[PDB]
């Protein structure tokens, strides 16, 4: 599966740089944006790797030196952890789960300080890990503005229109260390995932594997994230994780992965691959269709389950009473 790079420069990566997991996978298609099969996959909301969009062509020259000189003097959210797992957590929800202690911490920081922290860790051989995750804004320097304007807006705007998506909400800049991992989760927006530097292994699971991936409660800070530790699955708590099957690919500079809304994805920076750089494109999903057709799709049932949990958390006046009432509803009645 590793592609040979032009100029006889050899394989870009090697299977030894991939972490080992308990489940099988099959590859995501790698297609040209002009291939009608690629158009068919996006329309049916299925993942595809597009190899020739030129979506972030001007950003392919980006490295830490260029960015530090040009990305401005704004604050950048930088996560710090002692584990390779950078589990996302919503800070606004930690009040209702005050016995949850995240294993990664967020630190606001200037870009040059992030490069310095990176360098100091590299020097002292430390094992602290950093993952910069910052939405692009108007604090960026002029050259970054020019690069941003140089993205292939013609292509992605036509995608937005053809799929009826809502607004572009964010462009998340992602700069991670080799071996970094974002555990499995699904997002409530459409995503074009544009790789810039380094290589990222992406493992996706369709929405109909909800039963196998056990998301946290909606009111938990790790809402939308899987409870399963992919490194040591607890099959007694999560028995159906023994049935997961992933869609896998390794994206490199110039590749764009369509991560459809509600699709779970596990993403890791290749071992011994250096730093990785990515910019995503998050779009609001199309509205609920005019006429509902039955039976519902998996992602529609996910939307329903989320709304049930939201309603009960509100009606009961306390999110931690959601579980007890749900169990009362079902024990000896629906199970």
């Amino acid at each position: 599966e590793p592609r040979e790079e032009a100029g006889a420069l050899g394989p870009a990566w090697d299977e030894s740089q991939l972490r080992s997991y308990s489940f099988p996978t099959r590859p995501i298609p790698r297609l040209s944006q002009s291939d009608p099969r690629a158009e068919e996959l996006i329309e049916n909301e299925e993942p595809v790797v597009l190899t020739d969009t030129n979506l972030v062509y001007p950003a392919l020259k980006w490295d830490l030196e260029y960015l530090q000189e040009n990305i401005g003097n704004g604050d950048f959210s930088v996560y710090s952890a002692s584990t390779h797992k950078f589990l996302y957590y919503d800070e606004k929800k930690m009040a209702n789960f005050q016995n949850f202690k995240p294993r990664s911490n967020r630190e606001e920081m200037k870009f040059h300080e992030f490069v310095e922290k990176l360098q100091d860790i590299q020097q002292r051989g430390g094992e602290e890990r950093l993952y910069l995750q910052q939405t692009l804004n108007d604090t960026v320097g002029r050259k970054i503005v020019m690069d941003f304007l140089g993205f292939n807006w013609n292509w992605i705007n036509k995608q937005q229109g053809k799929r009826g998506w809502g607004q572009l909400t964010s462009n998340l800049l992602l700069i991670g260390m080799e071996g970094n991992v974002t555990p499995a989760h699904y997002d409530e927006q459409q995503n074009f995932f544009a790789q810039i530097k380094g290589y990222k292994r992406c493992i996706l699971f369709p929405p109909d594997q909800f039963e196998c991936l056990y998301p946290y409660p909606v009111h938990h800070p790790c809402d939308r994230q899987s409870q399963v530790d992919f490194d040591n699955p607890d099959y007694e708590r999560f028995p159906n994780f023994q049935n997961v099957v992933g869609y896998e690919t390794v994206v490199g500079p110039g590749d764009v992965l369509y991560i459809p809304m509600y699709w779970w994805h596990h993403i890791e920076s290749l071992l011994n691959g250096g730093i990785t750089i990515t910019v995503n494109f998050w779009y609001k999903g199309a509205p609920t269709p005019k006429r509902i057709e039955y039976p519902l799709k998996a992602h529609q049932k996910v939307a329903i389950m989320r709304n049930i949990e939201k309603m009960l958390g509100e009606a009961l006046g306390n999110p931690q009473e959601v579980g007890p009432l749900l169990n009362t509803m079902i024990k000896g009645r629906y199970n």
């Binding site: 809502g166 997002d187 409530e188 939308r224 999903g285 939307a303």
Partner: peptide
């Protein structure tokens, strides 16, 4: 058909504070 439309509504939450 409104109960269905109500429960089918989605947010826009992503892994970004």
């Amino acid at each position: 058909l409104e109960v269905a439309e109500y429960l089918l509504q989605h947010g826009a939450d992503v892994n970004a504070q």
